[PDB]
Design a protein around this ligand. Structure first.
Ligand SMILES: [Zn+2]
Ligand SMILES: [Zn+2]
Ligand SMILES: [Zn+2]
Length: 384
């Protein structure tokens, strides 16, 4: 019995003496031996703390011999390494030596100099990161990092989903390439002009002439009620290469109607657009941006909001319209305008010129969202 215990102790020293500091103590009836890793000439504090925590709370051991030790592993993040902690318990009261180990009892992320690396350091702003985590979390802090995914305690979350607030400097070659793709797309200078509440026979034709003059396309979210009597004009919008979307039949606050009456405001418009145009873009913009999860979840359409309100409907002033666009438009913006009043008709040329002068490419909503478009989903911009 004594010789067998001596053999286990010799084996562990042969295996782990180098690069570790060995602590030995009796805790009740249990005999504990812990090998703490050294970073340089000093014990990695957070690893010892993790082990001490186990000793205090779990541990428990009646008559046993308990070993703790670690191994360094890459973390999958640049300049960060992991210390995996193993705990092994030997039962010697038995005729035969029994043992059980937990290979990854715990784990600590560390900087190359042995200091703690916490999940908040992976971001340029923890507050927001926490927020996005919460989301992708809810839909689907001790963590791991593997194959381009963040793993919490397990739930594997793509690292991609937090690129907006991540400290990309921590990404290795592969993830750095993925980030480059994200960055390049994020910085593509595209904008989608959108026009609501039409068609209006007295203003829409002028808007179409102006878009044609400037060689750009737009997306028109039309009211079902305005289609009757203006069928040729709606066909004209589509023949000029613009995308026609659904703005409800008569512009009520959809969230204040019963579910089926709201759905029908939408489907009646899909029906008349399909009858006149032969097809639907399956894009729907709620009047006033008012919508509910139930409505969205009830229809196979993508709901298109906006991130830039030109306020043309409020200001009714060309100079104001241009100023709002100049200050608000961003990469991937969806601009809300109305092709039913003259101020917008008049301001359109200077708005287009300004944006072209700043290097923007004008795109339709389908061009902007292309692969991101899914039924039931809400979209405020290319990325939000
Ligand atoms: Zn074992
Ligand atoms: Zn409207
Ligand atoms: Zn569905």
């Amino acid at each position: 019995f004594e010789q067998k215990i001596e053999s286990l102790k010799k084996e562990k020293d042969d295996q782990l003496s180098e690069g570790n500091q060995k602590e030995h103590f009796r805790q009740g009836q249990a005999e504990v031996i812990a090998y703490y890793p050294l970073q340089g000439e000093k014990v990695i504090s957070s690893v010892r703390e993790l082990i001490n925590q186990d000793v205090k709370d779990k541990l428990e051991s009646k008559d046993n011999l308990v070993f703790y030790y670690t191994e360094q592993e890459e973390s999958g993040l640049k300049g960060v390494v992991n210390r995996n902690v193993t705990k092994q318990i030997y039962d010697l009261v038995a005729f035969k030596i029994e043992e059980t180990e937990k290979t990854s009892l715990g784990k600590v992320h560390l900087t190359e100099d042995g200091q703690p690396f916490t999940l908040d350091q992976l971001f340029s702003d923890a507050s927001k990161a926490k927020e996005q985590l919460i989301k992708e979390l809810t839909s689907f802090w001790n963590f791991d990092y593997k194959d381009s995914q963040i793993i919490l305690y397990e739930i594997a979350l793509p690292v991609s989903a937090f690129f907006d607030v991540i400290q990309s400097s921590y990404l290795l070659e592969k993830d750095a390439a993925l980030y480059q793709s994200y960055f390049d797309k994020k910085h593509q200078k595209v904008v989608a002009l959108t026009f609501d509440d039409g068609p209006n026979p007295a203003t829409t034709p002028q808007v179409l002439e102006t878009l044609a003059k400037y060689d750009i396309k737009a997306t028109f979210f039309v009211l079902g009620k305005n289609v009757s009597g203006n069928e040729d004009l709606v066909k004209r919008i589509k023949s000029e290469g613009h995308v026609v979307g659904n703005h409800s039949w008569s512009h009520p606050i959809l969230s204040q109607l019963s579910l089926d009456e709201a759905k029908k405001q939408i489907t009646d418009t899909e029906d008349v657009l399909t009858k006149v145009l032969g097809s639907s873009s399956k894009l729907m913009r709620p009047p006033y941006g008012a919508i509910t999860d139930d409505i969205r979840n009830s229809l196979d359409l993508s709901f298109i909001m906006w991130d830039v309100d030109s306020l043309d409907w409020k200001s009714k002033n060309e100079a104001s319209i241009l100023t709002e666009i100049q200050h608000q438009v961003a990469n991937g913006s969806i601009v809300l305008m109305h092709d039913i009043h003259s101020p917008t008709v008049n301001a359109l040329p200077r708005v287009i010129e300004y944006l072209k002068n700043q290097g923007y490419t004008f795109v339709t909503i389908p061009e902007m969202l292309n692969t991101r478009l899914k039924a039931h989903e809400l979209y405020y911009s290319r990325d939000e």
